[PDB]
Structures are given as structure tokens and as C-alpha cells.
Subunit: 267 residues, 4 copies
């Protein structure tokens, strides 16, 4: 397998439609030995991850909890065995309150909400690298999930700002990770029909936001030279595994686009 013998931490599984579930599945199909991290609904996450090709220990991690982050390296070492280190880390964490995404006017998001979204979606990429770099092997890889925020778009609002902040955070994380012989990169995915994305299209964040995200999805497949299947997270999962492998050894502080090439096309 592409990741045979590698010890990889995967955060971000919440449902069977989570991009992290598909990353975890493909990584296991490719011979990686995983450690999982889950937030708040641990009973649910264990039951979901019971469907993965192989059993993997599950650790609790709220990225807003400083105790969870301070104990994380020790908890991972206990799960993987003393003397072993991680070869890979996947950050597949993102959150923005409803005031910061959807039909709620961009000017009507209170800062406490925007700040919580930026903490979880951008700052935590640096918190996770700080916690795990001391237990990472040379030649290692840290990968985070991105949604191209180079241009403004309807409804994505403050989550776009959190992604722009995450891209900047990734470039600095690469400076730190480099001291450990570790790469840091983001995968900018095309839109994926997760449970939340389906709910948004169904009007969970207002009708106008639903209509706008449906047009974005259509335009994405139209612009993508190889097309874009929003119901298929496997091409995104494979790209994350390509970055976790030894096959992109000279790429760091960078962004790889697993979006069907849609960002390279105007129309």
C-alpha cells in the first residue's frame, strides 16, 4: 500500500459523510495504522468508525480545550506504544456558527461567533501541529482541509475568512514543521455533499443560501475539465493520502487542489 507501515492521526470524523471518514478508510486500504480523534459525541464517532476497514483507537479532542491539547501527545504515545512516533497528521476540522455562514448578512455576524469559527477552523491547525510535532518522525506529513477562499462567494461569508486565515497559518506551520523534517500542506477540495451540505441545499441556512450553493455545485462540475462529483469524497481522500506518502517530499507550506481543476478555469 501507498502508506504501508505509516502511523497516522486522523481528526474530524463525525458521520459517515465526513471527508475524514473517507481519508481514514483510504489510508487503511493503503496500509496505514491509524489513531483517531473525535469531538464531543464520542459514542457516535466510535459507532461510525466501527465501519472503517480496520479497528483504530479513538481519542477525545476538543481543539478549544487546552487540557486536551496539552495531554494529546502522551495519549497518542499510549495508543501507538512507547518508542513509536506518528508519520502523519490529518486536520479535517472546521466550524462556523450560523450567524457567520448562510443568509445571515455578512455584517451581522457577532465577533464572539467569528472568533469561535476562526479558533476551530484556522488557529487549531497550529495547535495540532504544536501538540504533535514533538512525536512526529522525520519525513512526516501534516495535512489540513481547505476550501479555496481566494475570491469571495455567496453564503460562505466568515468561513471564507477562516479559510484565508488557515492558508496563512499553514505557511507558518511549515516553518516550524521543517525543523522536524516534517511537511505541512492543505488540500483545497471541491464541494462535497456531506450531511451539512445537503441540509444547506435543503434550506437549513435560508432559501437564498440553498439556491446559491446549488448554483456553485453546478458551476464547479461545469468548470472542472475532468468534472466534479460532489457525492464522491474518494478523489479528495486519495489526494490527502498522496500528501501523507513519500511521493510529494519537496512540497510544504502549500495547497494542493483536489477540485477537478475547477479553480484553473473561468468558464
Amino acid at each position: 500500500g501507498l502508506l504501508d507501515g505509516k502511523r497516522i492521526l486522523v481528526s474530524g470524523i463525525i458521520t459517515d459523510s465526513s471527508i475524514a471518514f473517507h481519508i481514514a478508510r483510504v489510508a487503511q486500504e493503503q496500509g496505514a495504522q491509524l489513531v483517531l480523534t473525535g469531538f464531543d459525541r464520542l459514542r457516535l464517532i466510535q459507532r461510525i468508525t466501527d465501519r472503517l476497514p480496520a479497528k483504530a483507537p479513538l481519542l477525545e479532542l476538543d481543539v478549544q480545550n487546552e487540557e486536551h491539547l496539552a495531554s494529546l501527545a502522551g495519549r497518542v504515545t499510549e495508543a501507538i506504544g512507547a518508542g513509536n512516533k506518528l508519520d502523519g497528521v490529518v486536520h479535517s476540522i472546521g466550524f462556523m456558527p450560523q450567524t457567520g455562514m448562510g443568509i445571515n448578512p455578512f455584517f451581522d455576524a457577532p465577533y464572539a461567533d467569528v472568533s469561535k469559527g476562526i479558533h476551530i477552523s484556522a488557529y487549531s491547525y497550529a495547535s495540532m501541529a504544536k501538540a504533535l510535532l514533538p512525536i512526529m518522525n522525520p519525513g512526516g506529513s501534516i495535512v489540513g482541509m481547505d476550501f479555496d477562499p481566494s475570491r469571495a462567494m455567496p453564503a460562505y461569508n466568515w468561513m471564507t475568512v477562516a479559510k484565508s486565515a488557515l492558508e496563512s497559518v499553514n505557511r507558518f506551520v511549515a516553518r516550524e514543521a521543517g525543523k522536524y523534517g516534517v511537511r505541512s500542506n492543505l488540500v483545497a477540495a471541491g464541494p462535497i455533499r456531506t450531511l451539512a451540505m445537503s441540509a444547506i441545499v435543503g434550506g437549513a441556512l435560508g432559501e437564498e443560501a440553498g439556491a446559491q450553493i446549488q448554483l456553485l455545485e453546478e458551476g464547479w462540475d461545469q468548470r472542472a475539465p475532468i468534472g466534479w462529483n460532489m457525492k464522491d469524497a474518494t478523489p479528495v481522500a486519495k489526494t490527502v493520502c498522496a500528501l501523507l506518502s513519500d511521493w510529494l517530499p519537496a512540497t510544504t507550506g502549500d495547497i494542493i487542489y483536489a477540485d477537478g481543476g475547477a479553480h484553473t478555469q473561468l468558464l
Copy 2:
């Protein structure tokens, strides 16, 4: 003058080396009628602004204070006279605690500090547009100050992340401002030897940060095809006035680089 008859709000004056002081001076030399906003040290700001070519009313504005922002439009109207609106708005506000800039490791900035820096440096650009767009004329202009954060660099650390967030905020502010016939843009300046910049070079944020910012300054003038004089804020002030004028009427959600062309050159 370039700005004859225009009513322009200018925030960000603190000392006679503030980029906003030079923006305010050039705007007045070009016939603009100004309203100033100042944070916390109002006695100091009044005394500084006494040196501007013309007298201008000074209003207090802490961008972290929701009462100041909610009353701002009314306070500006009282200063410019009922029935008059602003043609221009200058955001020249930036702040990052010492834990987020300098020699303090990038991983050692607490989130409360990073969040305060992002609130002042990025979110406030949207708070200011929300407050003032209802009192802005069609053909109007909102301009903010940027420092190119496209690539990571030493010491700038979390302030780089705040600038990346500000660039994203600007693109969304342009969507809102467009409804008012108003443009929103940033001026990405080359480094300017303000009081804080001189203090940093003098080691106020650690020796290594000082040495690194001195090398950045030297490299900037070297890369700039027309050179870069860090002791001269006038080219930056003129660029802000170009954006406040009627002469860039089809530019919005954008960034204009007043950096001597240094960002267009590798070496």
C-alpha cells in the same frame, strides 16, 4: 485638488509617523474635508493632528467597542452637518499583542491574544463599513491598509494571519459596499519606519526579530524596480488618495500594491 469637495473619514492616527497621518495630510493638500477617528489617547491624537494642514474634527473610536460603532454614523453626521454624507473612508488600524509578533514562537501565541489582533486588524474593517456605508455617497470609496501576507516571513507571525483574514474580509465588504455604489480596496504598502518599526529594529520584540526586519527592509529596496524608501510614507499616502478619488472607478474588492513593485520581483 485630486479630492476637492470630498468628505473623508480617516482612522488610525496615533503619532506623526502613523501612515494615517500622511494619508490625512496628502488628502487635505488635495482639497478633501476630513473627519478623524482616534483610539484611547485622544489628547495625544488632537495635539498630533494640530500639525495637519487644516483643522478636522476628531471623534473617539475603539473598534472593539460596540457602543462606539453603533453611535459612529450619528457622531460623523453631527460633525459634517445633517444632509451631508462621506465620499471616503480610510481604515488604517492594526494591532497584534507581542505574543503574536516578534521572537515569541509562533506556537506560543495564546488564542485570546491572536483573537484580539484579528478583531482589531481584520474584523474591524467590516465593522467600520457596516457603520459608515449608510452615510456614504454613491461613487464613494473605503480603503484599508495591508501588508502582503501571501507568503510567510520571520517575526510577522500572527499579524500575517490577520492580514490574510483582512484581504478575505475586503472581498466580502466589496459585495456589501457595491449595493451603495461604493468601492472597497486595500493598499498593500512596503515597510514604513514608524515609531513601532524603529523600536522593533532596535530589538523591542527580541534581537532575532530586529535583525530579520532589518534584512526584510534591505531586501525590499533591492527587489523594488523603482526602489523603496521606508522613511517616506508619501508614496503610500498618494496611492490611498488615488483609490479615494474618481480615477479608479472600476476597481473593488481588490489590492493595490504601493511597495515599489518589490512583490513582482523574486531577486
Copy 3:
């Protein structure tokens, strides 16, 4: 006026819909003294330019003709008077054979055609700077016309490649121009309904290309936060004059977008 006392060379007038006609008109309304250059149909160009606010000498310039370029500086000096130099230069020249644009497959453009298009559209920006920099004043400005080629699009085909080449040429021209205290920049305009653009929409380059350019035009106005009027070259002409003025003195090797902000927006 914005350009009072300035001596500016303007190339690229062919009809009354030429972007250069509007640049020339606005520059004259702003007090500039112009010298014009025209290609091949000099009788037509003289008759067109008779409609400009003021009379301006017209010089012949085929950018593919080395004799025309070698004699250009001398011919300009004769027209503006010995001892006088130019403060500004406008390159508003572009051409691509029909095999390189439109419905003709991208793979079916012969290299002789692509090479002629790149010579006129990209290399000539450097030929013009070479010819005129020795007769340009410090503080001077060279401006060229661009169409954002960062992403591929239908029909534009090899002309997109010529624009990408022009952007690269501009960065090198800035290195040379800087030695003279001269700035070099491009204005990336939104689509303008020139005679050729109207002919393309009318199917002159095939039906599919017509339909595709009509969708691009519609999408441009939709994405532009301040809208985009393709029938109005005046905002583009004003942007070129802003770059020719003293008001963007720290910008070089760069691109200013006069596109209604459409490139900063995905949807």
C-alpha cells in the same frame, strides 16, 4: 487636470470603439499633450482621431517592423520638439489570428499564427519600452492593456497565452524602466464591446464562440460588486490615466484590475 503638462504617447487607435480612443480622449480632457501611433490604416486613424478633443500628431508604427521601432524615438522627438521628453506611454496593442481564437480548436492553431500573435500582443510591449525609455522623463509611466489570463476560458485560447506572456514581459520591463525612474504596469480590463467583440458575439469566429463570449459578459456583470458595463470604456480609460499620473508612484511591474471587481468574486 490629472495629467496637466504631461507628454503621452498613445498607440492602438483603429476605430472609435478602440479602448485607446477612450484613453486618448480622457487623457486630453485631463490636460495631457498627446502623440499618437497607428498601424497600417493611417488615413482611417487620422479621420477617427479628428474626433478627439484636441489635435495630436499621428506617427506610423507597425510593432513587427524593426525600422519603425528604430526610428520611433527620433520621430516622437521631432513631433514633441527637441529637448522635450515623454512622461507617459500607452501600449493598447493586441492581435491573434482567427486560428488562435474562437471555435477553431486550441490544438489547430499553427505556430506561425501563435508566434505572430505573441509578437504583437506581448513581445511588442518590451519593443516599445526599449524604443521610448531613452526619451522618457523620471517619474514617467508605461501602461499596457491586459485581459486576466490567470485561468483558461472558452474561445480566448492562444490570446490568453499571449496575455500570460505579456504579464511576464511587464515584470521585466519594470526592471529596465526603473533605471530611468519610470513605472511599468498593466490595466486588466473587463470585456469591452469593441467592433471586434460585437462581431465575435454575432458569430464572426463561429456560433459556439459567440454564445460563450455572451455568457462571459453576463457572468462578468453578475460577479462585479459594482457591476460591469461592457459598452462603457470610460472607467478603463480613467484607470489608465490614474497609472499615467503621479498618484500611483510606488506601483510597478504590476496589474491594476479595472473589471468592476469581477476577478475578486467566484459567484
Copy 4:
């Protein structure tokens, strides 16, 4: 192996320091079955390729020769056997006359020289895709070599313009390749000490160009968070193989940076 069962065409081998030699070697170590193309010195190329892990047929290809390109697909089919198609294509072709690179002033490159450089370095990427796409399998991959031309730099001059043109060509090739279920991408490598690069540093293109390329090399390793070894083409070769594999299936019309992350860092 990463490329087990894949049929890959590799162009660009001339010496044992050619980036294409290392791409060919790594692809063979990973189980690919290769077809090679060589220009002009076929006896030399055969002798060089005798050192590759496995024997591979060698075909003559001058990308400026329309007969060579028109017969290429037939010649490849004869070498790989009727009924078999290629899964991958590597373009590792670049050339610029000495007038277009080095100490020769940027303004002193005759167009015939610049045009020959652009034909070989940029247009040929589309000529090669046109020739080989009809004999490529779905899921296939076309990869070209790039040197980041986003910013101007000393000596690279017109070759920088050819790379900017190549990036634009790649985005259009992706539109065509997508119809075949084929991806098209470039690998932007850091500087590699090939025979020509060593000759340049030794002053083959003038002393000033030598000094400037030595400073670029040093600055590259300094800026790269994981460092940059210019004497090691293996990380670049591995990146090309990552793109030729099934592990980046949603990336097209794009650029992957195998430069040690140096482009993501200012200093």
C-alpha cells in the same frame, strides 16, 4: 510499485543530469514501462539511457518538426504494441537561445530567438498533447516541467516569459485532455544543478548572470522550510511520478511545487 502496469512516454533526456533522466529512473523503479523520446543527438541519448534500470525504446522527436509530431502516435503504438495505449506523458523540454537568457540585456533578444524558445518551451506542450491524447487511456496523466515565473528575476529573462506562457498552455491542454479522461499538470521545480546550470554558475552566460544564479540557489535553500538540495533531482522525479499515478485524480490544469516550499516563504 507506484506506477506498476503503466505505459509512460518520457521526453527530455539529453545527459545523466537531465531532470527527465531522474523521472525515467524513478518511474522504472516504480514499475512503469517506458517509451523515450530524444532530440537530435540520438546516439548520445541511447548511450545515456543504457544506464536506466530497464531498457526502453527510444524514438526521435524534434518538437519543431511537424512530420515528427504527425508520425509520433503511430511510432509509439509500434513500440508499445497495437491495442496498447499510454497512461502517462512527461514533457521535460525547454530551450532559450543565449540572447534570451543570461547577461544579454532583456531588450536585446531578437524575436526570432524568443519565438524559437517559446515554440520549444511552451507551444510544444500543446503539440505533444495533440499528438498523444488519441493514444492515451482514461485516468491518464500529462506532466510538464515548470520554473515558477510569477515574479521577474535576474538572467532568466525570456525563459521566464516562456514559462508564464507554458502555465497558460497547461490550463488549455487540461480542457482538451479532460475529454479523454486525462489530467494535465506542471511540476514547478526548485533549481537543479544540471550540466547547463553548472556552466551558467561558471559564467557561460556572463559573470553577472553566474553570480545572480548562485545567489538564487542560496536564497532558495534558505527560504525552503524543508531545505533545498539543488544536486538532488530525486524529490522532483518523485513529484512527477505522484502526478503520473492514480493518487492525484482530481487535480488538473494545475501546478504542483516541488521546490522545498521556497515559493511559500518571503524570507
